[PDB]
Amino acid sequence: STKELTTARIKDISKPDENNLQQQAPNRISPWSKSQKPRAEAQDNVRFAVKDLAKQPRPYAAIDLIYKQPIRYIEHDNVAVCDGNGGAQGHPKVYINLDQNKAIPCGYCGLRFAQAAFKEDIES
Amino acid sequence: MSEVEPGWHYWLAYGTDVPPNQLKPEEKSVRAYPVKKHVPNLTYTDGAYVPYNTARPKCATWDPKVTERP
Amino acid sequence: TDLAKELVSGAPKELITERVARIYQETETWKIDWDILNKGNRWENDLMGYQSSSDYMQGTILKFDTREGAIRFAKGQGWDYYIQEPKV
Amino acid sequence: YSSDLPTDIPVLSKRPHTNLLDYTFTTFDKMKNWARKSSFWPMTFGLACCAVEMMHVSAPRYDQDRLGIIFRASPRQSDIMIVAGTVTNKMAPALRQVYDQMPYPRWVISMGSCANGGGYYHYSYSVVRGVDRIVPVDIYVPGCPPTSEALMYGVFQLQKKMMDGQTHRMWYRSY
Amino acid sequence: PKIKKAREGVTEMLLENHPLDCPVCDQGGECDLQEQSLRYGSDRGKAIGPLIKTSMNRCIHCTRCVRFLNDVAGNSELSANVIDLCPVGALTSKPYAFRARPWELKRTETIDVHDALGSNVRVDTRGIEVMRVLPRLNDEINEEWISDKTRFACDGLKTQRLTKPLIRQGNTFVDATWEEALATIAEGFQKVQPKENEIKAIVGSLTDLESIVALKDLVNKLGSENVSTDGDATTVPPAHGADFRSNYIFNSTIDNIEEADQILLVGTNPRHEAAVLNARIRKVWLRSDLEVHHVGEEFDSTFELNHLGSDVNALAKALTGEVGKKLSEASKPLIIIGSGVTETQDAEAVYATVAKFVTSNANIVTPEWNGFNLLHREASRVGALDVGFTTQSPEVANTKAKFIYLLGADEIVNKDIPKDAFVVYQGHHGDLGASFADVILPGSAYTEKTATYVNTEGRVQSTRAATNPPGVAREDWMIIRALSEYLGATLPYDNLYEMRSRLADVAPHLLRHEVVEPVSEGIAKVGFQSLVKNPIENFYFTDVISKSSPTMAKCV
Amino acid sequence: TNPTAFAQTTRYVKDSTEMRTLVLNLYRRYLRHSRGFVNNYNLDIPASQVRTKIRQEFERQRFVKDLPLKNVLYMKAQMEFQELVNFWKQQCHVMQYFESIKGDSFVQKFLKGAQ
Ligand SMILES: CCCCCCCCCCCC(=O)OC[C@H](COP(=O)(O)OCC[N+](C)(C)C)OC(=O)CCCCCCCCCCC
Ligand code: SF4
Ligand code: SF4
Ligand code: SF4
Ligand SMILES: [K+]
Ligand SMILES: [Zn+2]
Incomplete structure (x- = not known):
């Protein structure tokens, strides 16, 4: 509604729609970076006059597929080891102090x- | 040729002996987002991909504001 | 030094007159580069945000060895220049 | 004067055949385009490493000849011009002379990175940054060099465009 | 040989618990762990502020984040210097985080304009955007230190910028061309037909000297003399006066502070007025027998002072008691007058009281020392005084001027701008001074121009251009000459060299880059004969760029 | 090996007077081929125009002084003669050679953007 589409936010007040071609992504309306140009603004260009907006590349926003994932928990330790959770085809191993x-x-x-x-305190 | 789905497209190229419908689940791709129907290359049609700049202009102009003489 | 070598280098007329070259020292050697243009040095392309430019000397830097060697070169080519003395 | 132009009459590429003439001049267009779709005779304008792939299409593995592709050296006998390889500044005036001599209809295919937008030598003092500054291009084949199949795919897509030509119906409906 | 194992030993030890964060390190391309674990090593094998992105996970320790704090800086105006001192990416800058890589940034050597020190800095840009500012070594002025204000106001140049001419139609500015803007001024100029004292010009803190000189020629050819800065000097002519250089310059310069004995603070807060020099005094105050006495409004300092009180009458008993006796005893005594003196009601009392103590002794003024200095806070005041860009009559300052042409001027709330006057503002931001305007002409940021600045020590330091001005902005003075043709007062200056050619007629020191022309001991004493509350409210709201800086919004 | 048409050995001339006579013959050689340059390259300008432009070319740089830089200017001008007479430059380059080319006040340059 001409307000959140051109502003960066942590989340979206409205529930997004997959079939709205003015959103930044199918699963998110407001852009997830201050410098990222809103999709609604970009599509208002000369070269989108006859080009169909339906077929344009609209990959799902990254900043949502992570926050759907439940938080991992560690039992009786204060160092978290993560190396991509995929074997040797992941990111370099890092230790997380808890x-x-x-x-x-x-x-x-x-x-x-x-x-x-x-576990009970953080989930609040 | 672009109609060939990418999973099978590697099989038709003799790069793998395991067809994509015979993969063991430990090897497949598991995505958190929907996988809709395959779409070919869309040249010569109005659905063609259009590049654009994803970054806002680096300079922001000033909003006109006036306060009168006290 | 007295030689008008600019007629043999083939450089455009604008290098002799409208451009200024700085002889600086970044820690044992000296360098020469041209100061940026007034306008048109860098404009944002309206298609993909590429850093366009019309200055053709933006990417040019000459690594010298000694100060007087650099000054000899600048006078030889007929280049306007100034020298920046590093801080001690 | 008296004038009344409708508004809902569609464009040519979307206008369906209505009467029998719209089927007659579609027959002439398909028959004429089918001739050009099959007798696809490019010109051997190999310039650089991209030219090796353009030869391997004629090789027995792919055999461009099976599709009716017979390279013709002279521009007059060639209706296509596959610009393969770097187009240096020293060549660009010569390239325009070769292109302008092709009788109509004429198509140009830009194969490889150098012909498309400059490629590796984009920042060179003596390299045209994309042949599209000199001759109009109808299809761009990306690669370095594009694989022998990528060129065939680029040929096929241009063929699919030629079969979409509607010249003789355009006279009837758009002219 | 055997020695190389020492490098292969310390290198191995450091890279033991170190995180594998090189791709995600903020300064991963220039840490002295990688570049020193390659040349010499083997091959196989909480938060503290909204300014420093702390990650002690990446430390190698050495407590340089600790040793510096208790030595130089000592809620710290200089805590940002810890970022440049830690070699590894343990403590990286937050505002710059995750935005650029060192191998891509282009560097230029230029100077700060926020305060009157004009310290040498190095600016790392990327195309048409300035990313970060780092200090470049200069023992004469700063020597590796810049306050958090200077290095975290960079993003203030990415917002609120004036990129187009603006014209008022009602009460809201509109986007208008340069052709109309340079005419709407001249069109309305002769609608009201200002008289000799009905034209006023106010120069801001960040206005460069080329515009300051070039504006006078335009003003003079239209017959006006109501020209001065945007200060609040109660005395209409400056109390020190622009007549002699020594009246308003640090005759000692910065390199003559570490060899002082007695220092007098004439109503000033050196922590909030010059952070670089404040630590310089603190560094001397640790090992030396330094004695500094506080004469002015009470404040909080990194170091205790020989505190006296808060009133002017405190200084009356200073130069004659033991407070001033040690000044006589000092082989190199120091007197410093801040920028907060001329603003005060008793500014005239300040110079007569002190210079009577500088005309009395002879050890204060030696062939190698001058005990009296000034400490201004703006980068345009000294430039104004060295060119005589100030009025010399209270009557002229009382005129209800019909045409006030602002040139970078912001602090003009106490300046009586007539409501009916024609106010034209030329600058590079939208702030207090912009609202008063009628036709706005965009200027240039200090990094985007080749501007010749003069610091509080009299040193003439210019700038080297980093980026083009945003939008369709032009150079600061180029508007004035462009404005000159529209008023019949065309100036004969047609290129930036000619503007420096004009500076030759102004003075000989203006054309000496990085060269300070002093006042001779045989004349500076004659300039002494002419004489015979902290000025700053908010540390993070001082100049135009800080107020518009999104970063400083985290400093409040 | 057989050198091509209109070739000369590259020689470092050590006389001031000899270089004067070499140039004078060279200028006539351009004027002799004035008709050819029009017919070879199909230039739109007539024969008198080419001579006028050639004269504008030769008049332009007659005041050089350095003999070491005299030979270089004579060497490269020989190449320009050899390239043009042998019909080596394309038609477009000669047409644009003669098709190349008062300033404006400071207000005019200030408004649009100057340089
Ligand atoms: C006497 C003169 C010399 C001989 C003339 C014949 C030369 C060859 C003609 C080539 C035709 C051609 O190319 O037809 C093939 C092209 C290729 O299909 P497409 O282009 O992708 O469009 C087709 C798909 N649509 C329309 C949905 C987009 O169309 C056709 O399928 C035409 C329809 C089939 C016609 C069959 C019925 C008519 C039979 C006529 C023969 C008895
Ligand atoms: S695109 Fe690559 S393969 Fe083709 S000519 Fe250029 S360098 Fe050679
Ligand atoms: S400080 Fe250097 S070695 Fe350590 S993680 Fe960062 S880039 Fe790597
Ligand atoms: S300065 Fe850096 S390396 Fe030294 S102790 Fe502090 S965090 Fe560790
Ligand atoms: K660091
Ligand atoms: Zn992880």
Whole structure:
């Protein structure tokens, strides 16, 4: 509605639609970066006059497929090891210190972790 | 040729002995997003891909604002 | 130094007059590069955001060895220039 | 004067055949385009490493001749011009002379990176950055060099365009 | 040989628990761990602020993030220098994070304009955008330190920018060409027909000296003399006066502070007025026998002072008691007057009181030392005084001028701008000074221009261009000559060299780049004969760029 | 090996006077082929026009002083003669050679963008 489409936000107040061709992505309306040019603005160009908007490339936004994934938990330890969760075809191994009391994402995958005790506190 | 689905497209090229419908689940691709119907190359039609710049202009102009003499 | 070598280098007329070359020192050697254009040095392409340019000397840097060697070159080509003395 | 132009009459590429003439001049267009679709005679304008692939299409593995493709050296006898390889500045005036001598109809295929937009030598003092600055292009084949199948795919797509020609119906309906 | 194992030993030890964060490191391309684990090593094998993206996971320790804090800086105006000191990416800058890579950035050597020090800095740009500013070494002025204000106001040039001419039609500016803008000024100029004192010109803190000189010629050919900066000097002529150089310059310069004994703070907050020099005093104050006395509004400092009080009458008993006796005893005494003096009501009392103590002794002024100095805070005041761009009559400052032409001027709230006057603002931002305007002419950011600036020590430092001005903006002075043809007051200057040619007639020091022309001991004493509350509210709202900077919005 | 038509050995001339006579003959050689350059390249300008442009070319740079730089200017001008007479440059380059080409006040340059 000419307000969120051209503004960057953490989430979307409205429920997105897969069939709206003015959204930034099928699964998200507002862009996920301050410098990212809104899709509604870009499609208002000379070269989209006769080109069909339906067939244009609209990959699903990354910043949503991660937040659907439930947060991983660690039991009786304060170091989280993540190396892509795929074997030797992943990101370099990183160790995540769990001293802080919230969900700390991985360096590359974006996966979030926790401890055994703070499982009830972080989920709040 | 672009109508050939990418999974089979590697099989038709003699790069694999395992057809894409015979893959073991430990090897397949598992995606969190829907996998709709295959779409070929869309040249010479109005559905052709159009490039555009994904970045906002680096300079932001000033909004006109006036406050009168006290 | 007295030689009008610009008639044999084939460089365009604009290098002799409308361009300024800086002789600086980044830590043991000296370099020469041309100062940027007033306008048209870098404009954002309206298609894909490419950093367009009309200055053809933007990518050129000459690695010298000694200061007087660089000054000899600039006078030889008939180049306008100025020298930036590094801070001690 | 008296004038009344409708508004819902569609464009030529979308206009369906209505009367019997619209089927007659579609027959002439298909018959004439089928002749040009099959007798696809490019010109051997190999310039650089892209030219090796253009030879391998004629090789027994792919055999361009099976599709009715017979390279003709002279521009007069060639209705296509596959610009393969780097187009240097020293060549660009010569390329225009070769292109302008092709009798109509004429098509140009740009194969490889150098012919498309400059390629590896895009920042060279003596390389035309894309042959599209000199001759109009109808299809671009990407590669370095494009595989012998990629050129065939590029040929096929241009063939699919030629079979879409509607010249003799255009006279009846758009002229 | 045997020695090489030492490099292969320390290198191996450091890379033991180190994270494999090189692709995701903010400064992964220039850390002195990689470049020193290659040449010498083997081959096989909480948060502290909205400014420093701390990650101690990447530390190698050495406590250089600790040793510096308790030595130089000591809620710290200089804590951002820790970013440039830690070699590894343990402490990286937050505003710049994840935006650029060192192998791509283009570097230019230029100067700061936020304060009157004009410290040498290095700017790392990317096309038509400035990414980060880093300090470049200069022992004469700064020596590797720049305050958080300078290096975190970079993004202030990416918003609020004036990119087009603007014209007022009602109460809202509109987008209008340069042809109409240069005519709407001249069209309305003769609608009101200003008289000799009905034309006013105010020069801002960030206005360069080329515009300052070139504006006078345009002003003079239209017959006006109501020209000065956007200060609040109660005395209409400057109390020090633009007559002699020594009246308003750091005759000692910065390189003559570490060899001082007694320092007097004449109503100033050096922590908030010059952060680079504030630590310089703190560095001396640690090992030396330095004695500094506070005379002015009370404040909080990294170091204690020989504090006296808060009033002017505190200084009355200073130069005659033991407070001033040590000034006589000092072989190299220091007197510093901040930019907050001329603003005060008793500014005239300041110079007569002190210069009487500088005309009395002889050890204060030696063939190698000058005990009296000024500490201004703007980068255009000294340039104004060295060119005589100031009025010399209270009557002229009282005129209800019909045509006020602003040139970078913002602090003009206490300036009585008549409501009916014709106000034209030329600048490079939309801020307080912009609202008052009628026809706006976009200028240039200091990085986008070759502008010759003069610091508070009298040193003439220019700038080398980094980027083109945004939009269709032009150079600062080029508008004035362009505006000259539209008023019949055309100036004979047609290129930037001629603007420097005009500076030759102004003074000989203006054409000496990075060269300071002092005041001779045989004349500076004659300039002494002429004489016979902290000025800053918000540290992060001082100049135009800071106010419009999104980063400083995290400093409040 | 047999050198091509209108070739000369590259020689470092060590006389001021000899270079003067070499140039004078060269200028006549261009004028002798004035008719050919029109017919060879199909130029739109008549024979007198080419001589006028050739004269504008020769008049332009007659005041050079350095003998070491005299030979270089005579060497390359020989190549220009050899390239043109042998009909080596394409038609377009000669047409554009003669088709190349007062300034404006500061207000005019300030408004549009100058340089
Ligand atoms: C006397 C003169 C010399 C001989 C003339 C014949 C030369 C060869 C003609 C080539 C024809 C051609 O090319 O037809 C083939 C092309 C190729 O299909 P497409 O282009 O993709 O469109 C077709 C698909 N649509 C329309 C949906 C987009 O069309 C056709 O399928 C035409 C329809 C088939 C016609 C069959 C019925 C008519 C039979 C007539 C023969 C008894
Ligand atoms: S695109 Fe590649 S293969 Fe083709 S000519 Fe250029 S360099 Fe050679
Ligand atoms: S500081 Fe250097 S070695 Fe350590 S993770 Fe960053 S780039 Fe790699
Ligand atoms: S300065 Fe850097 S390397 Fe040294 S102790 Fe601090 S974080 Fe570690
Ligand atoms: K660092
Ligand atoms: Zn991970």
